[PDB]
């Protein structure tokens, strides 16, 4: 049967094996996340989803930790806020200043989560990291200095598209996401990496520089290019 957990003291009935992030979503709280995608596997590396359990001295990765009976999840606690601020601080410390020239622009998860969960000032007094851009076809434009090594594109590529030509090379702060060779990521499902990349590292090349998200009007229609009716 369902077990009883608590989110900020509010009782929730969840199935065994449900994660902390899913319990908070069920109660109505969307925990900030970068590497977590519901359609993909659980990676738990960006560490942005760390939350505090009421009696646990250590924060837990909400996207990977299954809930136990009688767990009180403190979503808006001081420890959770400090953890989110620290993770955002590291991300933006190594992130480059490209927002005006970056197509992700006003629809960026890094920007929005920085404005909602991170600090507003920088303590980084050193130089930043620069990463050589790759070329993976005429559809996806890669500016890899903006990558946050969230491994969404790798996981999507392998699991969904059945193509394992993406991965991380090297280790440490020098880890780079790409192909390691001049190979184009050509597949019939290669725009979804543009969609799911939380930052502007992977962007649409035909759409490059043309518009900004706040200007666009969204019309909900269907697809006719095939018989799927997407």
């Amino acid at each position: 049967n369902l077990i009883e957990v608590f989110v900020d003291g509010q009782s929730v009935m969840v199935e065994p094996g449900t994660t902390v992030l899913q319990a908070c979503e069920k109660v109505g709280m969307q925990i900030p996340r970068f590497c977590y995608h519901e359609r993909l596997s659980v990676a738990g590396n960006c560490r942005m989803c760390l939350v505090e359990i009421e009696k646990a001295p250590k924060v837990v990765a909400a996207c990977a930790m299954p809930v136990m009976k009688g767990w009180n999840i403190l979503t808006n606690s001081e420890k959770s806020k400090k953890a989110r601020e620290g993770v955002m601080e590291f991300l933006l410390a190594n992130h480059p200043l490209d927002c005006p020239i970056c197509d992700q622009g006003g629809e960026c998860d890094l920007q929005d989560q920085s404005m909602m969960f991170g600090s507003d000032r920088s303590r980084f007094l050193e130089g930043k990291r620069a990463v050589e851009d790759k070329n993976i076809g005429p559809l996806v434009k890669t500016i890899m200095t903006r990558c946050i090594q969230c491994t969404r594109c790798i996981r999507f590529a392998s699991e969904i598209a059945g193509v394992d030509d993406l991965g991380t090379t090297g280790r440490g702060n020098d880890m780079q996401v790409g192909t390691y060779i001049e190979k184009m990521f050509m597949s019939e499902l290669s725009g979804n990496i543009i969609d799911i990349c939380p930052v502007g590292a992977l962007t649409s090349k035909p759409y490059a520089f043309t518009a900004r998200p706040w200007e666009t009007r969204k019309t909900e229609s269907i697809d006719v290019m095939d018989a799927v009716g997407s």
Partner: protein, 431 residues
């Protein structure tokens, strides 16, 4: 009561220093491979009880009850293989005990693997040895071949009806692959980035099977504990810290070495007895790192009266770690030494998760500026806060181990940092 003065009749790791034969005949000249069949017939529950009574704690860093861990592994079979994984990726900066155990007591290591596998119900034992230890791995393979020929391992091991295999896996250079979950990942032919708990290795380990990771010294002292009692092993040591331990004394010392002593020998006595003391005398001591790079440093004041023990060093805002005693005398640059340690951590970071990755690179840069004073006094507390953000927010314990030396340096030698910054400010002002 007093601790130390361990007797050669009670030292578990005989043949240390390689002064006796390391082959099967040499090991059998000592107590090795004695009544192993009787122990296996005693079975898993008896071995686990003996280990619990002995109270052996984890010898490869974080000291956990090995009896409790193996009891965790002692769940009933559910249609999957069972593995004991012996960690020999001795990448900790200061440790040579595992190398000595492998190179000089390979049959002790193999018998310990067999006993642990019998206690865990394990079909196989993968000894993951670091790739730099090529000669040690070859000696281990020679000993394994001798054991197989003698029938001590293989089907019907030691004539007990229990089938057990021992394999040796040579890793590449990765201090992160030293870690248990990263080691499991490296065995499976992946990059070697640590997993997230849960699932715990006792539930999902290498190949997805129940596998338990144990240190070389832990598995090597297991069969001696089984052959002997464990009341004796508990007698050697304090109440909650029992047994003998291998200490690697190195650095600014007269006679750097690796020795075996009681688990609560005072640090000053150990340095003055088994290593010839500090080079300029004990009055010339500056700092000591008692458990490898991960553990923080303690100054001479703490080292004067402290016991080389888990709880004793925890009460000293430090840890026992892997019992690697690095001694730094008064004529050294402590800031530069800690900067070199942080650079090591930056080089050895697997880079999977953001806090350790970015923060360790950031702290490397900050310390590189600190060692020349090219900073401001307001940045010391900023560095402390960065270390606190790194610590506890990472997948594996390398993030915590990369911030503890920084915290120790800030805690015990802040005046030195401020003095160096003031010196740099004065020098820049003059020009």
């Amino acid at each position: 009561t007093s601790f130390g003065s361990l007797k050669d009749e009670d030292r578990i790791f005989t043949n240390l220093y390689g002064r006796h034969d390391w082959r099967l005949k040499g090991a059998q000249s000592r107590g090795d491979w004695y009544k192993t069949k009787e122990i296996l017939l005693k079975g898993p529950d008896w071995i686990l009880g003996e280990v619990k009574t002995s109270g052996l704690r984890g010898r490869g860093g974080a000291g956990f009850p090995t009896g409790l861990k193996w009891s965790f592994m002692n769940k009933p079979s559910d249609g999957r293989p069972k593995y004991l994984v012996v960690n020999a990726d001795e990448g900790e900066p200061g440790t040579c005990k595992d190398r000595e155990i492998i190179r000089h007591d390979p049959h002790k290591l193999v018998e310990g693997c067999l006993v642990g596998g019998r206690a865990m119900g394990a079909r196989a034992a993968y000894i993951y040895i670091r790739g730099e230890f090529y000669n040690e791995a070859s000696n281990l393979q020679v000993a394994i071949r001798e054991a197989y020929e003698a029938g001590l391992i293989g089907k019907n091991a030691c004539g007990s009806g229990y089938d057990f295999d021992v394999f040796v896996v040579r890793g590449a250079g990765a201090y992160i692959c030293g870690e248990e979950t990263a080691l499991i990942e490296s065995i499976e032919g992946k990059q070697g980035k640590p997993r997230l708990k849960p699932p715990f290795p006792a539930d999902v380990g290498v190949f997805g099977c129940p596998t338990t990771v144990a240190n070389v010294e832990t598995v090597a002292v297991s069969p001696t504990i089984c052959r002997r009692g464990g009341a004796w092993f508990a007698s050697f040591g304090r109440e909650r810290n029992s047994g003998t331990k291998l200490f690697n004394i190195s650095g600014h010392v007269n006679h750097p070495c690796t020795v075996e002593e009681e688990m609560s020998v005072p640090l000053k006595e150990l340095i003055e007895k088994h290593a010839g003391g500090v080079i300029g005398g004990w009055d010339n001591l500056l700092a000591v790192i008692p458990g490898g790079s991960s553990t923080p440093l303690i100054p001479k004041s703490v080292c004067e009266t402290v016991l080389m023990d888990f709880d004793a060093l925890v009460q000293a805002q430090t840890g026992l770690g892997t019992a690697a005693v690095i001694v730094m005398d008064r004529s050294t640059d402590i800031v530069k030494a800690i900067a070199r340690l942080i650079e090591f951590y930056k080089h050895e970071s697997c880079g999977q998760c953001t806090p350790c990755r970015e923060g360790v690179d950031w702290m490397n840069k900050v310390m590189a500026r600190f060692v020349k004073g090219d900073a401001r006094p307001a940045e010391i507390d900023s560095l402390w806060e960065i270390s606190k953000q790194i610590e506890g927010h990472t997948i594996c314990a390398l993030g915590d181990g990369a911030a503890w030396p920084v915290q120790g340096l800030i805690r015990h030698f802040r005046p030195e940092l401020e003095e160096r910054m003031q010196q740099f400010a004065l020098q820049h002002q003059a020009r």
